[PDB]
Coordinates of C-alpha atoms in Angstrom, one line a residue:
Chain K
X12 CA -6.5 11.6 -1.2
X13 CA -7.0 8.8 -3.7
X14 CA -4.6 10.0 -6.4
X15 CA -7.3 11.2 -8.8
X16 CA -5.7 14.7 -9.0
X17 CA -2.5 13.1 -9.9
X18 CA -4.1 11.0 -12.6
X19 CA -5.7 13.9 -14.3
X20 CA -2.6 16.0 -14.1
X21 CA -0.4 13.3 -15.5
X22 CA -2.6 12.6 -18.4
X23 CA -2.2 16.3 -19.4
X24 CA 1.5 16.2 -19.4
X25 CA 1.4 12.8 -21.3
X26 CA -1.3 14.0 -23.8
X27 CA 0.7 17.3 -24.5
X28 CA 4.1 15.6 -24.5
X29 CA 3.1 12.8 -27.0
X30 CA 1.4 15.3 -29.4
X31 CA 4.6 17.5 -29.4
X32 CA 7.5 14.8 -29.5
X33 CA 5.7 11.6 -30.9
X34 CA 2.3 12.1 -32.7
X35 CA 2.3 8.4 -33.8
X36 CA 2.2 7.5 -30.1
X37 CA -0.4 10.2 -29.3
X38 CA -2.7 8.7 -32.1
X39 CA -2.7 5.2 -30.3
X40 CA -4.4 6.8 -27.2
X41 CA -8.0 5.6 -27.3
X42 CA -11.2 7.5 -26.6
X43 CA -12.5 7.5 -22.9
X44 CA -14.5 4.5 -21.5
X45 CA -18.1 5.2 -20.7
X46 CA -19.3 4.7 -17.1
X47 CA -21.3 1.7 -18.5
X48 CA -18.1 0.1 -20.0
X49 CA -16.6 0.4 -16.5
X50 CA -19.7 -0.9 -14.7
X51 CA -19.8 -4.0 -17.1
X52 CA -16.1 -4.7 -16.4
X53 CA -16.6 -4.4 -12.6
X54 CA -19.6 -6.8 -12.9
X55 CA -17.5 -9.3 -14.9
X56 CA -14.5 -9.3 -12.6
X57 CA -16.6 -8.7 -9.5
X58 CA -14.3 -6.0 -8.4
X59 CA -14.4 -2.3 -7.6
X60 CA -11.8 -0.3 -9.5
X61 CA -10.0 2.4 -7.6
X62 CA -11.0 6.0 -8.2
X63 CA -7.7 7.0 -9.9
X64 CA -7.9 3.9 -12.3
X65 CA -11.5 4.7 -13.3
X66 CA -10.4 8.4 -13.7
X67 CA -7.6 7.1 -16.0
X68 CA -10.0 4.9 -18.0
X69 CA -12.4 7.8 -18.5
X70 CA -9.6 9.6 -20.2
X71 CA -8.1 6.8 -22.4
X72 CA -9.4 3.2 -22.9
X73 CA -5.7 2.1 -23.3
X74 CA -3.9 2.0 -26.6
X75 CA -5.1 0.8 -30.1
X83 CA 1.0 -1.3 -30.9
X84 CA 4.0 0.8 -29.7
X85 CA 4.2 1.0 -26.0
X86 CA 3.5 4.2 -24.3
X87 CA 5.4 3.5 -21.2
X88 CA 8.8 3.1 -22.8
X89 CA 7.7 0.2 -24.9
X90 CA 5.1 -1.2 -22.4
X91 CA 1.5 -0.9 -23.6
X92 CA -1.4 0.7 -21.7
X93 CA -4.1 -2.0 -21.8
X94 CA -7.7 -1.5 -23.0
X95 CA -10.5 -2.3 -20.6
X96 CA -11.3 -5.4 -22.7
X97 CA -7.6 -6.5 -22.4
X98 CA -7.7 -5.8 -18.6
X99 CA -10.8 -8.0 -18.3
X100 CA -9.4 -10.8 -20.5
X101 CA -5.9 -10.8 -18.9
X102 CA -7.3 -10.8 -15.3
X103 CA -9.4 -13.8 -16.2
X104 CA -6.3 -15.4 -17.7
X105 CA -4.4 -14.9 -14.4
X106 CA -7.5 -16.1 -12.5
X107 CA -7.3 -19.4 -14.4
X108 CA -3.6 -19.8 -13.6
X109 CA -4.4 -19.2 -10.0
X110 CA -7.0 -21.9 -10.0
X111 CA -4.6 -24.4 -11.5
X112 CA -2.0 -23.7 -8.9
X113 CA -4.6 -24.1 -6.2
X114 CA -5.5 -27.5 -7.4
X115 CA -2.0 -28.7 -7.3
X146 CA 10.8 -20.5 -7.6
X147 CA 10.4 -18.6 -4.3
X148 CA 7.9 -15.7 -4.6
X149 CA 9.0 -12.6 -2.7
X150 CA 8.0 -8.9 -2.1
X151 CA 9.8 -5.5 -2.0
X152 CA 9.0 -4.0 0.4
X153 CA 8.9 -7.3 2.4
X154 CA 5.2 -8.3 3.2
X155 CA 3.7 -5.5 1.0
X156 CA 2.7 -7.9 -1.7
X157 CA 1.4 -11.5 -1.3
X158 CA 4.3 -14.0 -1.9
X159 CA 2.5 -15.8 -4.8
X160 CA 2.7 -16.2 -8.6
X161 CA -0.9 -15.1 -9.3
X162 CA -3.8 -13.5 -7.3
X163 CA -7.4 -12.8 -8.5
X164 CA -7.2 -9.3 -7.1
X165 CA -4.1 -8.2 -9.0
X166 CA -5.6 -6.1 -11.9
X167 CA -3.1 -5.7 -14.8
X168 CA -3.2 -2.2 -16.4
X169 CA 0.1 -2.3 -18.4
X170 CA 1.7 -5.2 -20.3
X171 CA 5.2 -5.8 -21.9
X172 CA 3.3 -8.3 -24.2
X173 CA 5.7 -11.0 -22.8
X174 CA 3.7 -12.0 -19.7
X175 CA 4.7 -9.2 -17.3
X176 CA 2.6 -6.4 -16.0
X177 CA 2.2 -3.3 -13.9
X178 CA -1.1 -3.2 -12.1
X179 CA -3.2 -2.4 -9.1
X180 CA -3.2 -4.6 -6.0
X181 CA -6.5 -5.1 -4.4
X182 CA -5.3 -7.7 -1.8
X183 CA -2.1 -6.2 -0.2
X184 CA 0.2 -8.1 2.2
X185 CA 0.1 -6.9 5.8
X186 CA 2.6 -4.1 5.2
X187 CA 1.1 -3.1 1.8
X188 CA -1.6 -0.6 1.0
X189 CA -4.9 -1.2 -0.8
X190 CA -4.7 -0.2 -4.4
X191 CA -0.9 0.1 -4.4
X192 CA 0.8 -0.3 -7.8
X193 CA 2.9 -3.5 -8.3
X194 CA 4.9 -5.4 -10.9
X195 CA 3.8 -9.0 -11.4
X196 CA 3.9 -11.7 -14.0
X197 CA 6.0 -14.3 -15.7
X198 CA 9.4 -13.0 -14.7
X199 CA 8.5 -11.4 -11.4
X200 CA 9.2 -13.9 -8.7
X201 CA 9.9 -10.9 -6.6
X202 CA 7.0 -8.4 -6.7
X203 CA 7.7 -4.7 -6.4
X204 CA 5.5 -1.9 -5.1
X205 CA 6.3 1.0 -7.4
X206 CA 3.7 3.5 -6.3
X207 CA 1.1 4.3 -3.6
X208 CA -1.6 4.6 -6.2
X209 CA -2.2 4.7 -10.0
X210 CA -2.0 8.6 -9.9
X211 CA 1.5 8.7 -8.4
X212 CA 2.6 6.1 -10.9
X213 CA 1.3 8.0 -14.0
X214 CA 2.7 11.3 -12.6
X215 CA 6.2 9.8 -12.0
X216 CA 6.1 8.6 -15.6
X217 CA 5.1 12.1 -16.7
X218 CA 7.9 13.6 -14.6
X219 CA 10.4 11.2 -16.4
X220 CA 9.2 12.5 -19.8
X221 CA 9.4 16.2 -18.7
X222 CA 12.9 15.6 -17.2
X223 CA 14.1 14.5 -20.6
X224 CA 14.7 10.9 -19.6
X225 CA 13.9 9.6 -23.0
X226 CA 15.4 8.5 -26.4
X227 CA 13.5 8.0 -29.7
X228 CA 14.7 5.0 -31.8
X238 CA 8.4 8.3 -35.7
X239 CA 10.5 5.8 -33.6
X240 CA 10.2 3.8 -30.4
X241 CA 10.3 5.5 -27.0
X242 CA 13.0 4.2 -24.5
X243 CA 14.4 5.4 -21.3
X244 CA 17.7 7.0 -20.5
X245 CA 18.7 9.0 -17.5
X246 CA 19.6 12.4 -18.7
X247 CA 21.2 14.1 -15.8
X248 CA 23.8 11.3 -15.8
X249 CA 24.2 11.0 -19.6
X250 CA 23.7 7.2 -19.1
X251 CA 22.8 4.3 -21.4
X252 CA 19.4 3.1 -22.5
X253 CA 17.7 1.0 -19.7
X254 CA 14.6 -1.3 -19.6
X255 CA 11.9 0.7 -17.6
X256 CA 11.2 -2.3 -15.4
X257 CA 14.8 -2.2 -14.1
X258 CA 14.5 1.5 -13.5
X259 CA 11.2 1.0 -11.5
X260 CA 12.8 -1.9 -9.6
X261 CA 15.9 0.1 -8.6
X262 CA 13.8 3.2 -7.6
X263 CA 11.6 1.0 -5.4
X264 CA 14.7 -0.6 -3.9
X265 CA 16.5 2.7 -3.3
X266 CA 13.3 4.3 -1.8
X267 CA 12.9 1.3 0.6
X268 CA 16.5 1.6 1.7
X269 CA 16.3 5.3 2.4
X270 CA 13.1 4.8 4.5
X271 CA 14.4 2.0 6.6
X272 CA 16.0 4.1 9.2
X273 CA 12.8 5.8 10.2
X274 CA 10.6 3.7 12.6
Chain A
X11 CA -26.9 -9.3 -4.8
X12 CA -25.7 -12.6 -3.5
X13 CA -23.8 -11.1 -0.7
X14 CA -25.4 -13.2 1.9
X15 CA -27.5 -10.4 3.2
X16 CA -30.6 -12.5 3.1
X17 CA -29.0 -15.2 5.2
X18 CA -28.0 -12.6 7.8
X19 CA -31.6 -11.5 8.2
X20 CA -32.9 -14.9 8.3
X21 CA -30.3 -16.2 10.8
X22 CA -31.0 -13.3 13.2
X23 CA -34.7 -14.2 13.3
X24 CA -34.0 -17.8 14.3
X25 CA -31.4 -16.6 16.9
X26 CA -33.7 -13.9 18.3
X27 CA -36.6 -16.4 18.5
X28 CA -34.4 -19.2 19.9
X29 CA -32.7 -17.2 22.6
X30 CA -36.0 -15.7 23.7
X31 CA -37.7 -19.1 24.1
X32 CA -34.7 -20.9 25.6
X33 CA -32.4 -18.4 27.3
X34 CA -34.0 -15.1 28.1
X35 CA -31.0 -13.7 29.9
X36 CA -28.8 -14.2 26.9
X37 CA -31.3 -12.7 24.6
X38 CA -31.3 -9.6 26.8
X39 CA -27.5 -9.1 26.1
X40 CA -28.3 -8.5 22.4
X41 CA -27.9 -4.8 21.9
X42 CA -30.0 -2.4 19.9
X43 CA -29.3 -1.9 16.2
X44 CA -26.4 0.2 15.1
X45 CA -27.4 3.4 13.4
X46 CA -26.1 4.1 9.9
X47 CA -23.9 7.0 11.1
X48 CA -22.3 4.8 13.7
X49 CA -21.2 2.6 11.0
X50 CA -20.1 5.4 8.7
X51 CA -17.9 6.7 11.6
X52 CA -16.4 3.2 12.1
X53 CA -15.7 2.9 8.3
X54 CA -14.0 6.4 8.3
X55 CA -11.9 5.4 11.4
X56 CA -10.6 2.2 9.9
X57 CA -10.6 3.4 6.4
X58 CA -12.4 0.3 5.4
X59 CA -15.7 -0.7 3.8
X60 CA -17.8 -3.2 5.6
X61 CA -19.5 -6.0 3.6
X62 CA -23.2 -5.9 3.2
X63 CA -24.0 -8.9 5.4
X64 CA -21.9 -7.5 8.3
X65 CA -23.6 -4.0 8.0
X66 CA -26.9 -5.8 7.9
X67 CA -26.0 -7.8 11.1
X68 CA -24.8 -4.6 12.9
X69 CA -28.1 -2.8 11.9
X70 CA -29.9 -5.6 13.9
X71 CA -27.6 -5.9 17.0
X72 CA -24.6 -3.8 18.0
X73 CA -22.9 -6.9 19.6
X74 CA -23.6 -7.9 23.3
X75 CA -23.6 -6.2 26.7
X76 CA -24.1 -7.3 30.3
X77 CA -23.8 -6.1 34.0
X78 CA -22.7 -9.3 35.8
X79 CA -19.9 -9.0 38.4
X83 CA -20.2 -11.3 29.3
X84 CA -21.8 -14.6 28.5
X85 CA -20.9 -15.4 24.9
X86 CA -23.7 -15.9 22.5
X87 CA -21.6 -18.2 20.3
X88 CA -21.2 -21.1 22.7
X89 CA -19.3 -18.8 25.0
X90 CA -17.7 -16.5 22.4
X91 CA -19.0 -12.9 22.6
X92 CA -20.4 -10.9 19.6
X93 CA -18.4 -7.7 19.7
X94 CA -19.8 -4.2 19.8
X95 CA -18.9 -1.8 16.9
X96 CA -16.7 0.1 19.4
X97 CA -15.0 -3.2 20.3
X98 CA -14.5 -4.0 16.6
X99 CA -12.9 -0.6 16.0
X100 CA -10.6 -0.8 19.0
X101 CA -9.5 -4.4 18.5
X102 CA -8.9 -3.9 14.7
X103 CA -6.6 -0.9 15.7
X104 CA -4.9 -3.2 18.3
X105 CA -4.2 -5.9 15.6
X106 CA -3.0 -3.1 13.2
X107 CA -0.4 -2.1 15.9
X108 CA 0.7 -5.7 16.2
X109 CA 1.2 -5.9 12.4
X110 CA 3.3 -2.7 12.4
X111 CA 5.5 -4.0 15.3
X112 CA 6.1 -7.1 13.2
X145 CA 5.5 -16.6 15.2
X146 CA 5.6 -20.4 14.6
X147 CA 4.8 -21.2 10.9
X148 CA 1.5 -19.5 9.9
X149 CA -0.7 -21.6 7.7
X150 CA -4.2 -21.7 6.0
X151 CA -7.0 -24.3 5.6
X152 CA -7.9 -24.4 2.8
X153 CA -4.3 -23.9 1.7
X154 CA -3.8 -20.4 0.1
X155 CA -7.3 -19.2 1.2
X156 CA -5.9 -17.0 4.0
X157 CA -2.6 -15.0 4.1
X158 CA 0.0 -17.0 6.0
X159 CA 0.6 -14.2 8.6
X160 CA -0.1 -13.6 12.3
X161 CA -2.0 -10.3 11.8
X162 CA -3.3 -8.3 8.9
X163 CA -4.9 -4.8 8.9
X164 CA -7.9 -6.1 6.7
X165 CA -8.9 -8.9 9.2
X166 CA -11.9 -7.3 11.0
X167 CA -12.7 -9.2 14.2
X168 CA -16.5 -9.7 14.9
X169 CA -16.3 -12.3 17.7
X170 CA -13.9 -12.7 20.6
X171 CA -13.1 -15.4 23.2
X172 CA -11.7 -12.5 25.3
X173 CA -8.3 -14.4 25.3
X174 CA -6.8 -13.2 22.1
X175 CA -8.7 -15.3 19.5
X176 CA -11.3 -14.1 17.0
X177 CA -13.8 -15.0 14.3
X178 CA -14.0 -12.2 11.7
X179 CA -14.2 -11.1 8.1
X180 CA -11.2 -11.3 5.8
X181 CA -10.9 -8.3 3.4
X182 CA -7.5 -9.4 1.9
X183 CA -7.9 -13.2 0.9
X184 CA -5.1 -15.4 -0.2
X185 CA -5.2 -16.4 -3.9
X186 CA -7.6 -19.4 -3.3
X187 CA -9.8 -17.4 -0.8
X188 CA -12.9 -15.3 -1.3
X189 CA -13.3 -11.6 -0.4
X190 CA -15.2 -11.2 2.9
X191 CA -14.8 -14.9 3.8
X192 CA -15.1 -15.7 7.5
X193 CA -11.9 -16.8 9.2
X194 CA -10.5 -17.7 12.6
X195 CA -7.4 -15.7 13.7
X196 CA -5.5 -14.5 16.8
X197 CA -3.1 -15.5 19.6
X198 CA -3.6 -19.4 19.2
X199 CA -4.4 -19.6 15.5
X200 CA -1.1 -20.2 13.8
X201 CA -3.3 -22.1 11.3
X202 CA -6.2 -19.9 10.0
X203 CA -9.5 -21.7 9.0
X204 CA -12.1 -20.4 6.5
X205 CA -15.3 -21.3 8.3
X206 CA -17.9 -19.6 6.0
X207 CA -18.2 -18.0 2.6
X208 CA -19.7 -14.9 4.2
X209 CA -21.0 -13.6 7.5
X210 CA -24.6 -14.6 6.5
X211 CA -23.7 -18.3 6.0
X212 CA -21.8 -18.2 9.3
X213 CA -24.7 -16.9 11.3
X214 CA -27.1 -19.3 9.6
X215 CA -25.0 -22.3 10.3
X216 CA -24.9 -21.2 14.0
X217 CA -28.7 -20.9 13.8
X218 CA -28.9 -24.4 12.3
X219 CA -26.7 -25.8 15.3
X220 CA -29.2 -24.3 17.8
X221 CA -32.3 -25.6 15.9
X222 CA -30.7 -29.1 15.6
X223 CA -30.4 -29.3 19.4
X224 CA -26.6 -29.2 19.4
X225 CA -26.4 -27.4 22.8
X226 CA -26.3 -27.8 26.6
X227 CA -27.1 -25.1 29.2
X228 CA -24.8 -25.2 32.2
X238 CA -30.2 -19.4 32.7
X239 CA -26.7 -21.0 32.6
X240 CA -23.8 -20.9 30.1
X241 CA -24.4 -22.2 26.5
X242 CA -22.0 -24.9 25.2
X243 CA -21.9 -27.2 22.2
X244 CA -22.6 -30.9 22.0
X245 CA -23.5 -32.9 18.9
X246 CA -27.0 -34.3 19.9
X247 CA -27.3 -36.7 17.0
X248 CA -24.3 -38.8 18.0
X249 CA -24.7 -38.0 21.7
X250 CA -21.4 -36.3 21.6
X251 CA -19.4 -34.7 24.4
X252 CA -19.3 -31.1 25.2
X253 CA -16.8 -29.3 23.0
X254 CA -15.2 -26.0 22.3
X255 CA -17.0 -24.4 19.3
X256 CA -13.6 -23.4 17.8
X257 CA -12.7 -27.1 17.6
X258 CA -16.0 -27.9 16.0
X259 CA -15.6 -25.2 13.3
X260 CA -12.0 -26.3 12.7
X261 CA -13.0 -30.0 12.2
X262 CA -15.9 -29.0 9.9
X263 CA -13.6 -26.8 7.8
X264 CA -11.1 -29.6 7.6
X265 CA -13.7 -32.2 6.6
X266 CA -15.2 -29.9 4.0
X267 CA -11.8 -29.2 2.4
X268 CA -11.1 -33.0 2.2
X269 CA -14.5 -33.7 0.5
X270 CA -14.1 -30.9 -2.0

């Protein structure tokens, strides 16, 4: 019940989809990590990766310049290690010295940086989508969160990496995309709406979902 | 590798030996080891993975147990059975779902500033709502599996050890230093070196944490 099934399924949609509607993007998907690559990264960060994340890495070791997730790049294992260490330095500096918030409330620690937030996606401008290994009291271990430079408010966008990948795969299959050969961007088809930043889409979806679940105790 | 497993084993030797030579009755409250499947079942129930030093401790004693119409090993505070750990964790998980003066941490940002967290596993109890336990969800300047105080009267949480091993060992060092009074009789803390007064062990741990933070 870890989201491994979802990860494998999703990568199929995404592998098939890219090869059909954007080969240039397909070609940036790297070879699988070896178990040793993963072990070495776990040793370096002193962390245990969630099953669905390891499953994802054993399919593609990130991307080798045009973001797969509507412009946002899937990070290589080496990039994940390096960036985690970069966030860990930032955290150290803050510990030896705007208001940070969470949606849902108390799901994510109200802090700028945490050693246990492992970035998997980057916008190459300081913001990420990653796996949270130190949830707030109303969060879940290995929930998927947004965090980074411009994320004073953190959002939980998925229950695991599998559900995140699959919901991205569902967006592609639903036709919620525009090509700008060109760059992949998001548009909501059913509504015939404008191009939107995928972060804003994820944020609104999180916010909507939270609001519709509030009534149930 | 450096999980503190060694420390746990070493500590339990001193504590087994000490109790036996000084307070037989207390030593008799130390339960038989926990079996591996007992643990597995507890890990399944809480959907959590115990740290090595904690598992190591449980595979030496499954907490304490008495039949007096009890008697905390940690200067009055009782080492919890696995069954008690499971039950109490689920009780704190209920509290967390239902959810307070200002919640705080020493060191700052080591422990989440919250009343209750599902990943705080109680190992010791004062039987009045307060605990020592293992923190499986540290703040950004904390360490995974650090030992913390939390519960009814701990609006401020204290990190008292880097792992369960170091905690047990520092308790063993207190015994061997002679920092104790028996009131057979109940075990209480006193700092022998400075001929100090009898004090609550929580207060001792709190001051030590506070001093350690200031010197760092």
